[PDB]
Design a protein around this ligand. Structure first.
Ligand code: HEM
Length: 153
């Protein structure tokens, strides 16, 4: 359970993401696809992308980064009270997309990397630790829902 201070550090850096959701989403998905190319196989409209310029020119990738960050922002703003936001996400990710917990770890590392690269002043060790806790709680709760749905990914 994060402290109120930790949630405030999470939501403070998140306000910087909200100034340009699409550009942050592109940098996060590009980092995930470049660091873990096996993840790109889950995206039918983007699986052919090779270079960073191709990834930045992709309308599908730019739209999907916004899809992901819109959902994650709503989850972070619930400050751990996110059962109703996690329920539909666990449903699709366990039964349709089949996204293993290791892939959620990969995208978490990509989020932390981009926030540290773009906003180092608002992402020092205090804020990095608070965001790490917030993404770890997200993964823990989604893993338990995955198992409830019969998915052991
Ligand atoms: C922070 C973690 C993530 C969040 C908040 C997130 C959120 C979403 C949301 C809101 C959607 C659209 C609604 C739905 O189908 O549930 C979606 C679709 C999808 N997500 Fe995720 N996702 C996350 C992580 C991942 C990861 C790591 C992968 C793959 C490596 C993934 C693969 C997919 C795919 C394949 C679709 C369908 C895309 C399409 O057909 O256009 N997601 N995700």
């Amino acid at each position: 359970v994060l402290s109120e201070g930790e949630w405030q550090l999470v939501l403070h850096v998140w306000a910087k993401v909200e100034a340009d959701v699409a550009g942050h989403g592109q940098d996060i998905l590009i980092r995930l696809f470049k660091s873990h190319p096996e993840t790109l196989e889950k995206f039918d409209r983007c699986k052919h992308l090779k270079t960073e310029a191709e990834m930045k020119a992709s309308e599908d990738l730019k739209k999907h980064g916004v899809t992901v960050l819109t959902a994650l922002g709503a989850i972070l703003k619930k400050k751990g009270h996110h059962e109703a936001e996690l329920k539909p996400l666990a449903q699709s990710h366990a039964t349709k997309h089949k996204i293993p917990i290791k892939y959620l770890e990969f995208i978490s590392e990509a989020i932390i990397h981009v926030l540290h690269s773009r906003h180092p002043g608002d992402f020092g060790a205090d804020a990095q630790g608070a965001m790490n806790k917030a993404l770890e709680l997200f993964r823990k709760d989604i893993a338990a829902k995955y198992k409830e749905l019969g998915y052991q990914g």
